[PDB]
Every structure is written in structure tokens, then in C-alpha cells.
Amino acid sequence: SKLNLSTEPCDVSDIECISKATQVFLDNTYQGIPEYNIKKLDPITIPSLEKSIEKINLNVRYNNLKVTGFKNQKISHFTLVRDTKAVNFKTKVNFTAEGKLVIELPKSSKTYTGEVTIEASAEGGAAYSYSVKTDDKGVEHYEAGPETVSCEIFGEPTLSVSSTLEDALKLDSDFKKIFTEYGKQLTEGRKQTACRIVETVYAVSVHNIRAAARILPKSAY
Numbered sequence: 001s002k003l004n005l006s007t008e009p010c011d012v013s014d015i016e017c018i019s020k021a022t023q024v025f026l027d028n029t030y031q032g033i034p035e036y037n038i039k040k041l042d043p044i045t046i047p048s049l050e051k052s053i054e055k056i057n058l059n060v061r062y063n064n065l066k067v068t069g070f071k072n073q074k075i076s077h078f079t080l081v082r083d084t085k086a087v088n089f090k091t092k093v094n095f096t097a098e099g100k101l102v103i104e105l106p107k108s109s110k111t112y113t114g115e116v117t118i119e120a121s122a123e124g125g126a127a128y129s130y131s132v133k134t135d136d137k138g139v140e141h142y143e144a145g146p147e148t149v150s151c152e153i154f155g156e157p158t159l160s161v162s163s164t165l166e167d168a169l170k171l172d173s174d175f176k177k178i179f180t181e182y183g184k185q186l187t188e189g190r191k192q193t194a195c196r197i198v199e200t201v202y203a204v205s206v207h208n209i210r211a212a213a214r215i216l217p218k219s220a221y
Ligand SMILES: *[C@@H]1O[C@H](CO)[C@@H](O)[C@H](O)[C@H]1NC(C)=O
Pocket: 093, 094, 121
């Protein structure tokens, strides 16, 4: 004993332990473990994110967004309320989302498609509670319930486009009319989109904790 640095399962009031077990898990599962219903988190591809601001007459659609950086996410807060087994934790993350942008200008019947890269620094949070459930036939497991995700962005995301796509947009009068009169709100849109990426990926990562809690007994508590 005297010098035991052996890790062992956490006591329910042992918060920095459970926080740390949450971190070890994230760090060793971001590649995915499909054998146990654990999804990849870095890289993670978001297939589609369509969006339409009316009647500023513009549709913007991000396609096949490859998101990287979540492997590096670091827990910044971790609450566990023993009465409800209610969990709340936040991580800090810097990600890059890389894919295709489609800009449609419906009143002109035009479309442009080029490469896009978004980068943000954020802090996202997840809140949910555990129930212990049957759960099949004598095996009892923790069951994480539906979560709420928060999103805070630090600074302003950088949005970056191919230079051919910049040129095409600069040279389009319908788009320029919008950028000139509504530049503000487009810039808004960019922060909404960062929070959408964050929401999407944090739901996956809680899916993963949820999937792990189903397999385990878990006197890994
Ligand atoms: C997160 O991104 C920001 C730059 O916007 C900076 O704090 C740092 O390079 C990143 N964090 C870490 C731990 O690298």
C-alpha cells in the first residue's frame, strides 16, 4: 500500500476521480469503438447543415464537414449531484470544420460551390441524469437520460473560403447587395453555425458515454 498509485473505481462523492474517468474515456474513445456502439469523434463528419435566412434571400448549406480537434478537448467543469445522479460537465475545445459550402441566391436562380473552413474555440456543456434500469435480465446498468447541450464561443470563429469562391461572390451583385446591406447578420450566422457543430458533436460524445454505461455493470462507479 504505502505507495499505492494504483487507480481504483470512484466513490460517488469522489468528483475529481469521476471527472478524471470521464476525461480518460474521451481521450481513449475518440477514434470510435464500433464494436460497442461508440462513434468516432475525431475526425467526425457532419453530412449536412442547411440553413436559410429569410427573406434576406440566401440559402447556405455546408456539406460533408470534417470536424477535427475534439480529441484534444479538456474538461473544465464537472458536477455530479448524488440525489438525482444528475451530471453536468463542460469541456473546452478548438476545432476546425472543413467541407463544401453551397450558396444559393434563389431570386437570381444562382448557386456557387467551393471549399470552406471554419475554426472556433468554444466551451460546450452537457447536462443529464442517470437512471439505473432493469436492464435486461438481472444485469442492472446506468442509463444516461436525454441531455441538454450548452455552447459558448470564445472570440469570433474564422470562416475561410477558396479564393475562387471569394472572387465569384465579390463579383455577384445579388450577393453583394446582401453582404452590403446585411453583412452584420451573415457574420451572426457564422457563430450560430459554430454552435451547431458543437451541439452535434457533443450529442455524439454523450451517446458514447451512454453506450459505455450500458455495457458496463458498473461498479466502475
Ligand atoms: C485553443 O485555441 C486558442 C486560439 O484561438 C488558444 O487558446 C490555443 O492555441 C488553443 N488551446 C490549446 C490548449 O492549445
